Amino acid sequence: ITDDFTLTSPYLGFCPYCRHSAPCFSPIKIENVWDESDDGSIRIQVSAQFGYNQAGTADVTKFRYMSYDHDHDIKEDSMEKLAISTSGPCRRLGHKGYFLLAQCPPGDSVTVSITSGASENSCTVEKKIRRKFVGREEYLFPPVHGKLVKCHVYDH
Amino acid sequence: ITDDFTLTSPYLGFCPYCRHSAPCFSPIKIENVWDESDDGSIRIQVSAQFGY
């Protein structure tokens, strides 16, 4: 057992959505989404690799890189060109290996998109995201003053 | 009494939100919001000074 990531590569997936709003292939397939966190953070597992250099490169760790696959070959991209949206832009929080952790208000779908300068590829999946919070009363945001209670959140 | 504005300065405030979604200090604190206008316009009173 180990945790090295230079030994693995990305894999092409089949997404129900694409740019042209019909099912098709893509290197950004997402097959899993978790939402149980009390804070609201969402874990998204994509088919590409980011947080690491091109799988098999001379260097393995580079935050700005985004390792994906197409045209029978793997290659990188600027990781700043990755966006997440449910009902509007989400704020990326963390990334590692296949998985990433983000956060955005509720909606009806989760979409992950990347712009390649001249073309854009987005893949999305239905998921019932609804705002939830802890306590005997449902508020909008935790105010400045109040009691302290135990909860469970995704470590950043 | 007067309306001269160069005699005041902006004051740091404590906002419930910040870019990291937790309360923190910031120079753009809001403490008042009025929306009674029928047209739907909204007045916002921020900590900083702009327009001058």
Binding site: - | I1, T2, D3, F5, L7, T8, S9, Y11, L12, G13, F14, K29, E31, E36, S37, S41, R43, Q45, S47
Partner: protein, 104 residues
């Protein structure tokens, strides 16, 4: 339109302000380095409410604890709107008023 004839907002001089960069405690003895070209007041209570004024100077105090003495960069030049996030100068007086624009 900018012109208004409704509303009345108060304004008064600011309170004091604390800072950590004004004091350094790398050694056991206290150290105060007020910003260059800037007056500063310092206060601590060890023995008595000893206070001092420093004009681009690093004055010293007998008591050594880091938490002990605190410094104000007092200027009391520009007025400020009252808000919960501020503090009041001991005078507690109203100095001026301003018009809230864009009125009904």
């Amino acid at each position: 339109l900018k012109e208004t004839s409704a509303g009345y907002i108060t304004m008064h001089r600011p309170g004091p302000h604390a800072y950590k960069s004004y004091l350094e405690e790398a050694s056991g003895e206290v150290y105060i380095k007020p910003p260059s070209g800037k007056n500063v007041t310092y206060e601590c209570k060890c023995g008595d409410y000893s206070t001092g004024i420093v004009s681009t100077r690093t004055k010293m105090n007998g008591c050594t604890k880091a938490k002990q003495c605190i410094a104000y960069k007092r200027d009391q030049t520009k007025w400020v709107f009252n808000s919960p996030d501020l503090i009041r100068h001991t005078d507690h007086s109203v100095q001026g008023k301003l018009h809230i624009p864009f009125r009904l």
